Curated annotation (Swiss-Prot), chains A, B:
Identification of the protein by name: Thymidylate synthase
Taxonomic lineage: Bacteria, Bacillati, Bacillota, Bacilli, Lactobacillales
Keyword Nucleus: no
Entry's family note: Belongs to the thymidylate synthase family. Bacterial-type ThyA subfamily.
Record key words, sorted: Cytoplasm, Methyltransferase, Nucleotide biosynthesis, Transferase
MF terms (GO), sorted A to Z: thymidylate synthase activity
Superkingdom field: Bacteria
Catalytic residues in the record: C198
NCBIfam families (UniProt xref): PRK01827.1-2, thym_sym
Gene that this polypeptide is encoded by: thyA
Primary site of residence: cytoplasm
PROSITE patterns documented for this protein: THYMIDYLATE_SYNTHASE (PS00091)
Pfam hit, one: Thymidylat_synt
Length: 316, 316
């Protein structure tokens, strides 16, 4: 089946993944160097052995394509994947004058009392960003995240470079280029960042009128992250191919350090006992071609019939 | 055998490599996305089915580690791998007042007369760089090449960053880091470069006291380039592991666009009929540990018994 490479990766990590401790104090089982490809003409690689929220994937990817770096857009689409990173800024800023939120991550996980007060200052924060423009501009802006790295790379001369927009033109005028690359890794910023980009760099390739894309992911969470990671890039490949009038090819996903956090074992095993169902189909808007102007309704998934969602804890 | 992954790659390109035209007007057979690993505790992956000049590999790698960007160092070790790039600068500069060298590449290949006058201005040039300091500093300095990207990345604040030196310290103080990355790809420079780095980015990884390294190569010449490419990185892995007092693990080589130029077919087939011999052994200087101060005699290859060298044309 289409998603088999994912299940195979999981099994492999359980079979030969050596224990490797990580900063979160949790502990993982990892491997270094792995590659899996997906033939996109066979369907969309959105996992059927577990329910994955495509809406969250669409809204975040579009957020990226717009070159946006402000959470507000996401909150407007009920997407809370990036909230924590912004909330941190708020909590640490001197303008914050409320309950102490020191390491609200594991604390809210190990404390029932805190896991409500924390969930209050957060909802409070999300309200200010959505309504208070001055607040949104100050605390709702992440700064260095995919949207600005892809479309607004800052140069030494003080300008900005639209990597993605440029690369798309190169594909149109020089499809056989072996330099169709986009990097999110900047040696200058990396040491001062809280989370240096996981999806380090990707390359496009064209042959026989078909667009393929390879992604180099330096670190990956087999259970929680990868299911999303695959759909984001399999989707970007379609969008870029839509814009360039090409056919879709393969999505090659390359891993540096792929891992399973020890607290997800039973969950991954449970999923592995499920039998993949036929994959869904993607449907992009034919009358609209500028993918940078795309919006939710311009992308639709058909025939996604997944197994029930599987719950698992986070790693902290 | 140790080098089998290389032979397997070659066969695969001959079997399923679709024709894909390239800028050099030559024409290639390519594939997108491939990965091969080499267990470095089994020997040094220097091809035995064809003679490869290790000396050229040592001298170029050391040139890189020193953060050097001037050809002089190479010429002093009889290494002419980078000459053309510098020679171009000379020929195009107004200070050049001699025979016309327009596209001296294919011209020297399609003309017997020219393939001597060109080989004269070149030897002349190599003499000036080696003896004329002012000339060396002006024309012998490549500027943006691996040595400066690895150890002197220019920031917007006008400073310089030693990526490699920093990463080596991170390994020593945080071996389990999933951020042990070095990038040679800078979105600001790429569009103005004659040859954007082929070896785009690499990552280190540690487990059980063993250092592994994965390389992402965006473009590769299966016949002429890869045999070198493999030894350079299998060697850097040893040097970095020497410096950090770790054991050696695997060298994972990841390809974006791997290709065979149509004029190397008979040569690759011929090599494929040869049977790999036992791989050589590397030997680094035990009393010397600062790899940045390493020199030729500090690295030695033992038991390399290759088949005769195979001749093939260049692509232009
Ligand atoms: O899109 C994402 C974002 C994060 N992670 C995971 C990778 C690691 O589990 C953790 C980041 O830890 P570091 O690799 O930065 O050290 O988050 C993913 O798999 N995919
Ligand atoms: O170390 C190197 C340097 C160059 N090449 C090859 C790759 C391509 O054949 C050509 C560069 O063409 P572009 O990919 O830049 O377009 O040189 C290698 O394989 N290895
Ligand atoms: K980069």
């Amino acid at each position: 089946m289409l998603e088999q490479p994912y299940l195979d990766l999981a099994k492999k990590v359980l079979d030969e993944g050596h224990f490797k401790p990580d900063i979160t104090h949790t502990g993982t089982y990892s491997i270094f160097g792995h590659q899996m490809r997906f033939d996109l003409s066979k369907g969309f690689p959105l996992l059927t052995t577990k329910k994955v929220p495509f809406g969250l994937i669409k809204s975040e990817l579009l957020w990226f394509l717009h070159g946006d770096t402000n959470i507000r857009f996401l909150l407007q689409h009920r997407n809370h994947i990036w909230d924590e990173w912004a909330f941190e800024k708020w909590v640490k800023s001197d303008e914050y004058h409320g309950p102490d939120m020191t390491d609200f991550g594991h604390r809210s996980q190990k404390d029932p009392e805190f896991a409500a007060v924390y969930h209050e200052e957060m909802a409070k924060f999300d309200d200010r960003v959505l309504h208070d423009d001055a607040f949104a501009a100050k605390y709702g802006d992440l700064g260095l995240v995919y949207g600005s790295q892809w479309r607004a790379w800052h140069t030494s001369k003080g300008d900005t470079i639209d990597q993605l927009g440029d690369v798309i033109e190169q594909i149109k005028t020089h499809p056989y280029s072996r330099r169709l690359i986009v990097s999110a890794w900047n040696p200058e910023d990396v040491p001062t960042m809280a989370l240096p980009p996981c999806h380090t760099l990707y390359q496009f390739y064209v042959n026989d009128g078909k667009l393929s894309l390879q992604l180099y992911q330096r670190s990956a969470d087999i259970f929680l992250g990868v299911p999303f990671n695959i759909a984001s890039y399999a989707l970007l490949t379609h969008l870029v191919a839509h814009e360039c009038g090409l056919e879709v090819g393969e999505f090659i996903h390359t891993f540096g350090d792929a891992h399973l956090y020890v607290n997800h074992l039973d969950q991954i095993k449970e999923q592995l006992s499920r039998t993949p169902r036929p994959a869904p189909t993607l449907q992009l808007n034919p009358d609209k071609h500028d993918i940078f102007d795309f919006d939710m309704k311009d992308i639709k998934l058909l025939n996604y019939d997944p197994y029930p969602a599987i719950k698992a804890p986070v790693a902290v």
